[PDB]
Amino acid sequence: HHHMLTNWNYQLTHFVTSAPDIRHLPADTGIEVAFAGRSNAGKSSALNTLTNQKNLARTSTQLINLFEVAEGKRLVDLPGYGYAQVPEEMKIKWQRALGEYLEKRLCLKGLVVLMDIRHPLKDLDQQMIEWAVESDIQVLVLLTKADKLASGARKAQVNMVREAVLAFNGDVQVEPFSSLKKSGVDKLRQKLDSWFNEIPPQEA
Amino acid sequence: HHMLTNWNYQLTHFVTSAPDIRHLPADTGIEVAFAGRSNAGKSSALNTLTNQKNLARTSQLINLFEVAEGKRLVDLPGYGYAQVPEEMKIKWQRALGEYLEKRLCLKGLVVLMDIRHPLKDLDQQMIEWAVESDIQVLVLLTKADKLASGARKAQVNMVREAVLAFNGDVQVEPFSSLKKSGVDKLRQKLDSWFNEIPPQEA
Numbered sequence: 001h002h003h004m005l006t007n008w009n010y011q012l013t014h015f016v017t018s019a020p021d022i023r024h025l026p027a028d029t030g031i032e033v034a035f036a037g038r039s040n041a042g043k044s045s046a047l048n049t050l051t052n053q054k055n056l057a058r059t060s061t062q063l064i065n066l067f068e069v070a071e072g073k074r075l076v077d078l079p080g081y082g083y084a085q086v087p088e089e090m091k092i093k094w095q096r097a098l099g100e101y102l103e104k105r106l107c108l109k110g111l112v113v114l115m116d117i118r119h120p121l122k123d124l125d126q127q128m129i130e131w132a133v134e135s136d137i138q139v140l141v142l143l144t145k146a147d148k149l150a151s152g153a154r155k156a157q158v159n160m161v162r163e164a165v166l167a168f169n170g171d172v173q174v175e176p177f178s179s180l181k182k183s184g185v186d187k188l189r190q191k192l193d194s195w196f197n198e199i200p201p202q203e204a
Numbered sequence: 205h206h207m208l209t210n211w212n213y214q215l216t217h218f219v220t221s222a223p224d225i226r227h228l229p230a231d232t233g234i235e236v237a238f239a240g241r242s243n244a245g246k247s248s249a250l251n252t253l254t255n256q257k258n259l260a261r262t263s264q265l266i267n268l269f270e271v272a273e274g275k276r277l278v279d280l281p282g283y284g285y286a287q288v289p290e291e292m293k294i295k296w297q298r299a300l301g302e303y304l305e306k307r308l309c310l311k312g313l314v315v316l317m318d319i320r321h322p323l324k325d326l327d328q329q330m331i332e333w334a335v336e337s338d339i340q341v342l343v344l345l346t347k348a349d350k351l352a353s354g355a356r357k358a359q360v361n362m363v364r365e366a367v368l369a370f371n372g373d374v375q376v377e378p379f380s381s382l383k384k385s386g387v388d389k390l391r392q393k394l395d396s397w398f399n400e401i402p403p404q405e406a
């Protein structure tokens with residue numbers, strides 16, 4: 001029996017813990033893939049769709065939610081940005097905390113940035129991609145709510161964003177996604193499988 | 205707007221069995237059939253796809269499973285009838301061909317074969333019947349974990365070259381139920397086939 005690319009079962013992903021900040025994250029070991037986006041972009045719906053769970057994050061918030069796909073393989077749900085009607089001091093603090101996670105989390109292997117296909121690359125979207133590429137993290141951009149566009153317009157948006165992300169000095173993949181129509185889940189699973197194939201040498 | 209749906213194969217459930225195509229349910233919706241030599245790894249592949257230990261069984265019945273309303277996986281009884289009388293062998297081989305040629309709702313055939321010994325016994329006849337009936341084929345080279353990466357790729361390339369001889373659409377992929385590898389390729393093919401809704405049912 002020889003090594004092969006594993007297709008992990010994301011429907012067995014389960015909640016393990018939350019953290020109020022990076023100082024209270026679990027040990028910086030294994031593999032993490034992070035998810036981020038503007039509030040309301042569709043991040044919780046995408047995670048719910050990927051894992052076939054109705055309310056994966058157990059929401060009843062700046063909490064970081066962590067989920068295990070398997071031992072040592074975690075999805076990290078970063079609190080949505082934008083911060084409607086928030087004081088400038090808190091906004092800067094919360095934005096910096098996202099950057100600190102991307103730059104200092106040694107077990108981080110990929111970042112999924114979710115953004116509405118109709119309004120991509122707004123608010124902290126570009127800064128999140130830039131921080132990831134500076135830290136040698138591969139990025140998957142999911143253009144969410146892709147069911148709101150007809151096929152021609154959908155492809156035009158995907159192409160526009162693919163052209164735009166060439167300006168980042170790193171590896172940025174762009175895919176349309178719809179939680180509502182359960183479309184694009186395959187592209188997400190393929191990216192996750194590629195990232196969870198990269199076992200830390202000191203743990204293998 | 206319409207999009208390519210990624211169906212949840214882990215929710216697949218058993219619907220019915222049938223001894224022959226005359227006792228199958230209504231010839232509507234979409235079926236994708238699975239076939240291979242006995243012991244090639246067909247039940248393991250279906251059980252891996254669906255994350256179920258005993259959905260597909262192995263000890264001449266056709267077994268039908270439903271992914272969603274109108275979308276079915278069809279488990280055809282394995283061929284390579286060791287020590288079966290020649291009369292029964294011919295009849296059971298003909299029954300497989302009759303299903304492929306006469307099932308109007310059939311949209312794809314998955315032929316599973318050991319990566320070490322592809323295209324043996326009824327393998328080529330199953331592919332040929334499918335292409336003659338304008339059915340797309342996915343060949344899964346099973347037990348691919350038994351080969352190192354170089355030899356695995358060499359077998360895949362050799363089978364890809366060989367299936368050019370069939371006058372149809374034949375995709376070839378390595379697969380391992382043991383290592384849970386190649387499941388994405390299978391899901392992609394199934395999703396593509398289940399995207400093709402019969403016009404009279406849309």
Ligand SMILES: Nc1nc2c(ncn2[C@@H]2O[C@H](COP(=O)(O)OP(=O)(O)O)[C@@H](O)[C@H]2O)c(=O)[nH]1
Pocket residue numbers: 037038039040041042043044045046080144145146147148177178179180181
């Ligand atoms: N049309 C459509 N609406 C979506 C989709 N995903 C999310 N939404 C809607 O967008 C809103 C915010 O989604 P949610 O997942 O809670 O966003 P989050 O704040 O980023 O976690 C809700 O009204 C969802 O129903 C999608 O794929 N298609």
Ligand SMILES: Nc1nc2c(ncn2[C@@H]2O[C@H](COP(=O)(O)OP(=O)(O)O)[C@@H](O)[C@H]2O)c(=O)[nH]1
Pocket residue numbers: 240241242243244245246247248249261262282346347348349350379380381382383
């Ligand atoms: N190494 C390995 N063995 C496998 C794989 N799939 C099936 N087998 C073994 O091959 C035998 C036959 O598999 P099975 O799925 O029962 O075959 P079927 O008769 O075609 O349904 C069993 O001993 C399986 O454990 C695989 O991917 N890798």
